[PDB]
């Protein structure tokens, strides 16, 4: 029901590789990627194989250039589809310090600035109770991205960040 | 990395349809299915589209007839890949009555007979804490099957049963 399309050159030119499911490594099929077409659903694309490296969240739409997904280079070699749970419920707990410690807040809302709403410059642990969320490195959903499926996150490395630099977050809705 | 293959006739004869991901409806491509070949991983196949109707769990291997997966007919039209968490932990809570009520036991092991091990003839609710499990209608892992890839089951209908008929269960391990 879903599919994503990669192109080597800008504005949907050049060789192409299709994926309708979670592709773990296609760097042997594409030397680079400068255009992306998403047909159904929301995908997460990773720089390096096995869902590692930098990641980006691309909902249904067209992306003629690599800046349209706030990308930093034309290197992408893995991708996975984002299954959204049914029920409409979104709920997350964020903690000041590691292992679900420190002062904790719970919210069901997008937060464009954590420093202003919760007075925290960093986040070291997290519990995703309902739905799927994205952590952004900078406020107003700019900077590096990190996907958070559900389960629990004890350290910032568990969602893919070296530093605990997280300043905004929001939910994925289709 | 995984794929499943359906055949219309026995012994891998007839027309063929491949699926590499979660296929929600392929009854228009195959009128019937009598043979199945699974390449890597464990799949769940459903009688009717949109993952409804009777279900069966087929791990990696070959199934020349439809009795090899304890099937009751050659009618299958949807299938899902079963994603196992890489944590090795399997843990389940079973409850006598609905809404996580009644006498409750917790185990991490397969149970070929619930009546003898826990003194229960039925199970009306369930909490899956770690891993993925299968409920079987009869003891010793025979009869109708039910997949449990979630977390919370308040009623027997939530795992796909009209009746609370559960008499054995075991974990899916690859």
Curated annotation (Swiss-Prot), chains A, B:
Residues 2-40, 41-83, 90-130, 131-173 form the Beta/gamma crystallin 'Greek key' domain. The keyword Acetylation applies. Gene3D superfamilies: Crystallins (2.60.20.10). One of its GO terms (molecular function) is structural constituent of eye lens. One of its GO terms (biological process) is lens development in camera-type eye. Residues 84-89 are annotated as: Connecting peptide. SUPFAM superfamilies: gamma-Crystallin-like. Pfam families: Crystall. Has a two-domain beta-structure, folded into four very similar Greek key motifs. This is Gamma-crystallin S. The gene is CRYGS.
